[PDB]
Amino acid sequence: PKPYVAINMAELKNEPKTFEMFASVGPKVCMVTARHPGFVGFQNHIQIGILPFGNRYGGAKMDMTKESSTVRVLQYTFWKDWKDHEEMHRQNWSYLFRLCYSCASQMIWGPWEPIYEIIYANMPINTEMTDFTAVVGKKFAEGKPLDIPVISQPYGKRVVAFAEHSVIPGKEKQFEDAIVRTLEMLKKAPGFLGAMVLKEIGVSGIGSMQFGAKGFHQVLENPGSLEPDPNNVMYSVPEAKNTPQQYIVHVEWANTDALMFGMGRVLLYPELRQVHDEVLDTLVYGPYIRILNPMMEGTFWREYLNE
Amino acid sequence: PKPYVAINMAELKNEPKTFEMFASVGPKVCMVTARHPGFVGFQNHIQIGILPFGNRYGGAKMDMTKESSTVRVLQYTFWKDWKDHEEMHRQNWSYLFRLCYSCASQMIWGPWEPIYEIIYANMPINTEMTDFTAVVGKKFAEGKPLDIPVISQPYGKRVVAFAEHSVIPGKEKQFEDAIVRTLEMLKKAPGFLGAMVLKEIGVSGIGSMQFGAKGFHQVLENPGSLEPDPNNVMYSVPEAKNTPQQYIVHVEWANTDALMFGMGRVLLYPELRQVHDEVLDTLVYGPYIRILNPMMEGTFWREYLNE
Amino acid sequence: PKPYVAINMAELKNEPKTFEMFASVGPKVCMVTARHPGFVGFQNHIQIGILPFGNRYGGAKMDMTKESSTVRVLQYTFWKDWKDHEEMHRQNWSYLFRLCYSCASQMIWGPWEPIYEIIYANMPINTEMTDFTAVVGKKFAEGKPLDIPVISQPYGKRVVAFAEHSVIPGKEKQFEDAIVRTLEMLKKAPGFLGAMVLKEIGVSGIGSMQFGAKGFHQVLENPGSLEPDPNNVMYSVPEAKNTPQQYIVHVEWANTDALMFGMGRVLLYPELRQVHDEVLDTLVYGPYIRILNPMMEGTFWREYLNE
Amino acid sequence: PKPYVAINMAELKNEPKTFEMFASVGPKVCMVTARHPGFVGFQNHIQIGILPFGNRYGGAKMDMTKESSTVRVLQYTFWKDWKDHEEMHRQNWSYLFRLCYSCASQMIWGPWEPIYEIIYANMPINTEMTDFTAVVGKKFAEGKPLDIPVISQPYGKRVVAFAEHSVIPGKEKQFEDAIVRTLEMLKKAPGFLGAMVLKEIGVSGIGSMQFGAKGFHQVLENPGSLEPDPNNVMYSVPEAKNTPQQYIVHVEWANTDALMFGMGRVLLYPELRQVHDEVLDTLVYGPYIRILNPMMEGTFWREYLNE
Ligand SMILES: [Fe+3]
Ligand SMILES: [Fe+3]
Ligand SMILES: [Fe+3]
Ligand SMILES: [Fe+3]
Questions:
Q1: CB atoms within 10 A of CB D66
Q2: Cα of C307 vs its chain's centroid, Å
Q3: Cβ neighbours of residue C80 closer than 8 Å, sequence gap 6 or more
Q4: DSSP structure class, residue C158
C-alpha cells in the first residue's frame, strides 16, 4: 500500500565534520526509528545542486558540491500511518532528541519536518546491477514479464529531481489530474526510474523541534543529554498544513543528463508540453527543482509500496 | 554437496613485499593443495576493513587499507571430507611447510586454521559480467528460469561480510534456526550475492604449525628447508573445537554500500529485526563483522556445492 | 591472598587522541572501580610489540609502536572475589558505561573481558629506585633478609611478557605442573621481576558489552548518556569459560633484552628446555608472546597478594 | 567453416613512433589484404605480458607494457584456403612489400609468418555491450536460446592467452585429444570467451621476407620503393613445417584475472588437472603463455567460422 512520508529538512555547514556525523550518527537515528513497527523504510538525500532551466537560475548548476558552503539534507522516512511517526518520536524521545541534537553544532537551518500523503506512485524496487538476471528469471518463471522493473540502483547511484510546487486555492484538482497525466507520459523518457507526487498534510512539530515556550528554552539551554518536554508541542500535524497547498513531484533518473533532458521533455515534446501547461496554470510557486543524491536508504520501503 | 571448510588465518606486515609473496607463493600453495582429489576449490581473502556499526567501532571503517600497518588473510579451502584436508597436509608436507614457512619473514600472528562444517548455504556460481547472456540462454533452454543466479563477479569484484559469533552453551539450536531464518529474509536486500553459515568442528594443528615440543623446536630452528615432524601434532581436529561454539556468518555483496545497508537490514527493517533479535539473544561474543576482499579463488568450489 | 583478575582487552587507533583519552578518561574509570570494597588494585598495559621467536614472526618486533596503526590495551583489575567485579559493574553502571562508551570513537575491536583465577604467583611489591634503602633497612631490622625483593619499578619502567596458551582437554594438570616447574627455574634469569599464571574461569558479559538483543540495540543506538539494561546480559561468567582451557603466563622483566633472553632460557638452557618441553606437549594454541608496557597501575594489588 | 590462419610475428621498439605506425600503416595493409576474396578477416594483437606461473617466470608479469623496451605483435589473418594467403601476397606484392617494409625502421626481429590449420574452435562472434539485447531477442525469436553467446567485446576489451606448445613426434594424437578434452572442460571457468587450437602446417617465406640470395640482397638494399623478386622464395609453405610439431592454444578471457585463474583451472581443479596432465606428458616445449591484447580486428572472421 502507499505509505505516508515524513521529510526531515535541514541545512548544515559543508565541511568534513558534517559528513563524518552523517556516517556515525545517521545510522543510529535510523536504528531508533526502526523500533516502531509502523516504520517501513527511509530514503535519505543530500542536495547536490539545482536545475537551472537554461539560465533562469544562471547561478546554479546541477552539481554545485565543489563550490557550496552548505549542504541541504532531505531525509524521507516512510510510515504505514503518519501517526506512527508521531508516536515513534514520543516513545523514543530520549534517544532521538539526544542523537539529533548532536548535529546542532553543524546546523545552519532546521530541522523542519513536513508530512506528506502519496497521491500517485510509480516507483520500482531498487536493484543493483548484479541482481537483474535473477529478477528477470523470477518474473518469467511467474509468467509476469511486465513486472520486470528498470534497474534503479540504490545507495548514491542514481539522482532525484525534487520539484517544489504550491497551488492556487481551488486549483488542486486541476493540478492533481494534470500532473498525473504528465508523469504517465514522462515515463517514456530514457533513464526514467520512477515518480511520485507528495501532497503535504501537515508538519511534525516534534520532528521540527518546534515547541511552546518551555521546550524552546530547554532546546536552547540544552547540554545535550536532557530532553525537552515532548508534550510541549502546541499544535498537531494537520494544524500546520499550508495553504496554498504544497506538493513535491519526486522523479528519479539514471544520471543528471537523463534528468535534465528527461524533465525537459515536459518543455521540449509538444504533446507533453500541452499537458504540462495545465500544471503550470495552477501554480502559486514553482516549479523549483532541486537535484538530490539518495545516499543512505532502506530500500524495503518500495517493497511495502509495491506489495 | 556441501563441502567442509578450512580457513587459514594470519596477520602480516602491510607492505609491498607481503603482497609480492602473495602473488608468488600463493599460487604455489594452491597448486600443491590441488594434488588431493578431495580438494574442491578455494577462496582467499584479505581483510580490507571492519563494519563500524555506526560509531560502535568509531575508529574503524569499511576500507582501512590506506592506513593499516597490517594485513589479515583468510584463506578458505573446500574439502569433500575434512579428513582430506589433514591427509593433504601430510602427503605434501615437504612442499607445503617450506612454501608456507617462506612467509614467516612477513608474519605477525598465525597461521591458525580452524575447520568448519557448512550448516546452511545459499551460494551461487560466480560469473563475470560477460557470462550472463549464455547463462540466461542455457537456463531458459532447460526450462529452469528460476536457476538464473545473480551475477557474483570473481577475483576481487565483490565484497564479503565475515561475521564472527560464539554462542551460549545450550543455545546452538536457537542460534542456528534463527540465523537461517534471518538469511532467508536477508536475501531480498539489493546486491545480496549469497550467504552461508560455518560451524566450527575443530582446528587443524598441522595447518596451524601447532606441534608438540619436538615440532615446536624444529619450527623455531628451521633454516627453511627442513620439515618439522608432521606426526608431532598432539591433538586431533575435534579435540580443539571450542566451547562456546563458534560460527561464521559469511555474506557476499555487490559492493561495500550494499553490504553496509544490506547487513543493516537486520537492524532497520522491523520484521527482520525481530527475527534477528533471536540470534542476538544467544551470543557470548559478537557479531563482529570483518569486510573481506575475495581476491584469489578457485570458483569451482561453488560448482561442487550446487551440483 | 591470591585475588581474581579481570582483563579488559581492546584495540584502538594509534593516534594522539587515543592516548589523551587514556590519560583523561582512564583515571575516571579506575576511580569508579575503586568504589567497591572488593577492588584491590589494577595494572593497565599497552602492547608495545610481539616476541618474534627468531623469525617465526619475522614481521614483528618487541617494539612496534613507531609503525603500528593500532594500539592494544590490556587492563587488569584485581578482585577479592570475581563476583565483586560483576557486582561493581552493575552497581556503578551509569558512570562506567558512559565513561567506557566515550572510548568507542577510537575503538576498532573490543571490549572483551575474560576473568581469571591465579593458580601460581611469584610477584613482588613494586618499588621505585629511591625506595630500596628503606626496604633493605626494614627487612634486616625484622630479621627477614630473604623477603628483600628485586627492584620492580612501577609506571612504565619495566616490561611484561604476556604469553598466551590454550591446552588440550585432559592435559590441564600436566600443563599446570610443568609451567610452575618452569617458572620456578626461570626466576634465576637476570632481570626477572616476577611471574604468575592466570587460568580463565569465564567471561564478563557486562564488561565485554555483550548483551541480548535489547542491550545490543541500546549500545548501537546510544547517544552516550543512556545506559543499556545491565540485566540484559544473557550468560553468567562461568557459562562463557572456554574449552580448550586458556591460560596466560605473565612474566615481568627489567627490560626487553632481559625479556628476550630470559624467556629464551626455556629454549637455550638444556635443563630448563626439558622441563618446558612438557608444557609444549599440552598446547592447542601458543605460546604467543605479547610485549606489554604496564603504564598505569595501582601497585597495592601486590600488597594484598603478598599480605 | 574453419578458415586457415596466418600469424605474422615481429618485435619492434616500444616507443611512440612504433604505435603511430600501427595506427597509420596497419589499416593500409589490412585493406590491401582484403583485395583477395579468400580473405575472411583478421585479429591483430600486441603482447602485453607473460603468464608467470607463480614465480616460474618471476621476472615476468601479465602487464609489462610500462617497463618493456620492445613490443611484440601477432597479426592473425584468416583465409578460406591457406593458398589464398600466398596468392594475395604475390598479386599485391608491390603494395604489401612497400607498406610492410616501411615498418623496418622500428623492427628488431621479424617478420616471421607461420601458417596454421584450426583443429578445434569454440569461438563466438564478437559483440559490444550494446548488442546483447538484440542478440538475445533474435535468438529467442528463432527458438535457439542455446546459441546466445557470452559477450566477447572487440577492439581491446578482452585478453588472450597465447599458449605455445611443441609436441614429441608420435604423440600428436595424444596431445590433440587431451587438449580438446581440456578446452571442453575449461569453458566452465568464469569469463571464458572462447578457445581454438592452431596446428602449424608451414611457413610463408614471402610473408617472412625469407628469399633466396637475390631477394635477400634486394631487401637489404631497398630504398623502400622497389620490390624484391617475389618468385625468389625458395621453399613452399609445407616444406618449412616444423618437427617437433608446433601448436598454439588460443584462449580468450574477460580480463587478466579471469585469464590467470581460468587457465589456472587446469592446475587447481583436480578433475581437469588429471586431463591436462595428458597434454603435459606429450610436450617438447611449453606451455609458454603470452598475454595478448586483440586491439585491431575484422570481427567477421568469426561469422565465417560459425556460419
Ligand atoms: Fe521525524
Ligand atoms: Fe590447510
Ligand atoms: Fe571490568
Ligand atoms: Fe601474410
A1: 6
A2: 21
A3: C1, C3, C4, C38, C40, C304
A4: S
Q: Do A28 and C221 touch (CB under 8 A)?
A: yes
Instruction: Give backbone dihedrals phi and psi of C164, rounded to 5 degrees, phi first.
Output: -80, 140
Neighbours of chain B (3+ CB pairs under 8 A): A, C, D
Question: How many angstroms away from the CA of B57 is the closest CA of chain A?
Answer: 10
Chain B residues 112-151 with CB within 8 Å of chain A: 132, 135-136, 139-140, 145-151
Closest CA to C302 of C118, C157, C137: C118
Q: Are B134 and B159 in contact (CB under 8 A)?
A: no
The 3-state DSSP class for residue A268 equals helix
- Which residue numbers come right before each break in chain A (C to N over 2.5 Å)? none
Query: What's the longest Cα–Cα distance across chain A?
Result: 62
Dist CA B216 CA B205 (whole Å):
12
Q: How far from the centroid of its chain's Cα atoms is residue D12's Cα? A: 17
Closest-lying ligand to the alpha carbon of B84? 2
Taking the CA atoms of residue B150, residue B156, residue B161 and residue B165 in that order, the dihedral angle to the nearest 10 degrees is 120
Residue C287, preceding bond cis, omega within 30 degrees?
A: yes
User: Structure resolution in Å?
Assistant: 2.1
Residues, CB within 5 angstroms of ligand 4 (ion)? D 6, 207
**In 3D, which of B181, B165, B193, B180 has the Cα closest to residue B262?**
B193
D89 Cα–ligand 4 center, Å: 7
Task: Give the Cα separation of A72 and A295 in Å (integer).
Answer: 13
Three-state DSSP state, A116: strand
Which residues of chain C does A99 touch, with a Cβ-Cβ cutoff of 8 Å?
221, 223
For B234, the enclosing helix (H) or strand (E) is: none
Q: How far is the CA of A41 from the centre of ligand 1 (A)?
A: 12
Chain B CA closest to residue C223: B55
C-alpha cell at A200: 503535504
E strands, chain C, in order: 4-13, 39-50, 70-79, 107-112, 114-122, 159-167, 192-203, 245-253, 283-298
Q: Which of C53, C69, C213 sits opposite B68 (nearest CB)?
A: C69
> Is there a contact between D195 and D113 (Cβ–Cβ < 8 Å)?
no
Residue A30, chain B, CB below 8 Å: the answer is: yes
Question: Using an 8 Å Cβ cutoff, are C181 and C275 in contact?
Answer: yes
* A130: helix, strand or coil: coil
Q: C39, C78 in Cβ contact below 8 A?
A: yes
B53: left (phi over 0), alpha (psi -120 to 50) or beta: left
Of the candidates D236, D208, D298, D274, the one whose C-alpha atom is nearest the C-alpha of residue D27 is D298
B184 annotated among ligand-binding-site residues: no
Hey, is the C-beta of A268 within 8 angstroms of any chain C C-beta? no
